[PDB]
Amino acid sequence: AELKIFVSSQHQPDIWRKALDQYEAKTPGVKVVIETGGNTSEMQAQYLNTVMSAKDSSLDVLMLDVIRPAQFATAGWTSDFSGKDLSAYLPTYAEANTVNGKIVALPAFADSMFLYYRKDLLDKYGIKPPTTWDELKEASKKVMEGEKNPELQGLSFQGKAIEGAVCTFLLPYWSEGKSLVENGKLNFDNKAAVDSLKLWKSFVDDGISKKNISEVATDDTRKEFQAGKVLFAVNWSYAWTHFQGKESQVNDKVGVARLPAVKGGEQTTCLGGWEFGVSAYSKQQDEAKKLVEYLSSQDVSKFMAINAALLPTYAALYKDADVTKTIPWFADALPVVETAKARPVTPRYNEVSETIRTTVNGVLAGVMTPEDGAKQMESRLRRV
Numbered sequence: 001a002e003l004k005i006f007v008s009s010q011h012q013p014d015i016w017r018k019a020l021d022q023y024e025a026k027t028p029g030v031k032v033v034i035e036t037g038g039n040t041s042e043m044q045a046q047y048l049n050t051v052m053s054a055k056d057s058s059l060d061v062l063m064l065d066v067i068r069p070a071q072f073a074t075a076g077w078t079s080d081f082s083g084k085d086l087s088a089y090l091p092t093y094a095e096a097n098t099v100n101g102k103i104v105a106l107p108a109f110a111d112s113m114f115l116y117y118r119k120d121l122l123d124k125y126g127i128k129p130p131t132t133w134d135e136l137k138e139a140s141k142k143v144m145e146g147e148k149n150p151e152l153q154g155l156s157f158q159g160k161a162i163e164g165a166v167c168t169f170l171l172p173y174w175s176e177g178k179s180l181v182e183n184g185k186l187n188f189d190n191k192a193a194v195d196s197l198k199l200w201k202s203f204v205d206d207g208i209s210k211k212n213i214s215e216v217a218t219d220d221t222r223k224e225f226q227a228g229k230v231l232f233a234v235n236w237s238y239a240w241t242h243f244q245g246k247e248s249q250v251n252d253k254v255g256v257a258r259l260p261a262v263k264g265g266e267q268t269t270c271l272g273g274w275e276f277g278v279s280a281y282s283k284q285q286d287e288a289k290k291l292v293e294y295l296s297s298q299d300v301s302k303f304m305a306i307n308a309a310l311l312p313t314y315a316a317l318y319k320d321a322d323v324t325k326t327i328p329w330f331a332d333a334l335p336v337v338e339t340a341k342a343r344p345v346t347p348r349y350n351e352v353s354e355t356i357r358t359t360v361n362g363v364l365a366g367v368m369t370p371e372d373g374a375k376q377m378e379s380r381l382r383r384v
């Protein structure tokens with residue numbers, strides 16, 4: 001059989017390729033081909049909606065974001081792993097991949113947002129990693145003043161109208177102790193929503209973040225930090241491999257911290273991560289399941305942690321000696337993953353994402369005020 005697997009371009013398809021070569025080498029008569037979609041999750045989702053809506057049978061295995069199971073379950077777009085127990089996997093992912101009793105997908109890898117920081121620069125100015133956005137502003141000012149570097153950004157975060165801007169919006173909202181869904185219903189704290197949009201705007205206005213932060217996607221943050229142009233970056237675990245790689249200016253100059261809190265708030269972060277679904281329209285159900293069981297296996301989890309800084313779905317791999325030798329900070333990441341806040345679980349998540357990310361982007365592009373943004377977001381969300 002020739003299986004086709006849709007892989008996020010953001011999640012190291014060349015490294016997944018090394019795992020698939022080990023699979024082929026030990027599975028005579030099976031070949032795997034990677035189709036590589038957009039960097040961002042909302043573009044991958046728009047593409048999969050069209051091929052899955054059209055019942056297209058070319059894809060066998062789908063790498064899907066943690067926010068996807070509700071949609072994919074309700075639409076019947078994946079083959080359930082009937083009577084599968086997800087107890088080997090972090091409960092947050094066991095839970096994300098179960099919808100009305102159905103195991104929609106096997107966890108592929110974990111993720112959460114961290115604060116990447118230039119540990120060389122904080123050391124140089126004697127600064128402690130910031131625990132509040134206010135400490136991060138103060139640290140940014142001190143470093144940018146001393147560095148006399150017209151290309152050094154204080155903070156890079158995602159302001160482009162992408163899935164990651166949803167995460168941007170919720171970080172200060174969650175930090176204030178608010179939720180967007182309470183007892184299944186939309187629970188919109190106006191004041192917390194406005195304060196989140198003004199916080200992100202304040203980084204641009206205060207000269208800590210670049211004027212065109214509204215054009216910055218997740219991987220732009222990764223590229224600019226890697227290039228030595230960013231003191232503080234909001235990003236995901238995959239960025240670490242690029243930072244420590246052959247094409248980086250910041251080898252051994254990167255610290256990892258929990259995201260700062262809003263003043264008086266909690267250091268909350270966004271749950272990310274991905275899972276492997278078998279397409280309901282695969283003509284190779286059995287062979288695809290065998291591939292997903294290998295790709296969701298502890299040995300592959302471990303390989304992808306070491307080679308791609310993708311956080312394990314297996315709790316035991318966080319303290320594995322080879323994992324922690326390659327990426328020391330993984331030894332302390334699991335509590336961040338297991339307490340990370342989840343975006344709303346809903347089959348209509350795409351419409352939820354569209355509303356929040358366009359509002360964030362509009363405010364950061366100076367199209368609307370934070371105040372109007374919050375009002376627009378609430379109105380649009382109310383009817384979705």
Ligand SMILES: O=S(=O)(O)C[C@H]1O[C@H](O)[C@H](O)[C@@H](O)[C@@H]1O
Pocket residue numbers: 010039040041042065066110111112162163164165218219236271272273274
């Ligand atoms: O970069 S983005 O696609 O806009 C946002 C995504 O980032 C990371 O890949 C996470 O693992 C995903 O959960 C998240 O949705």
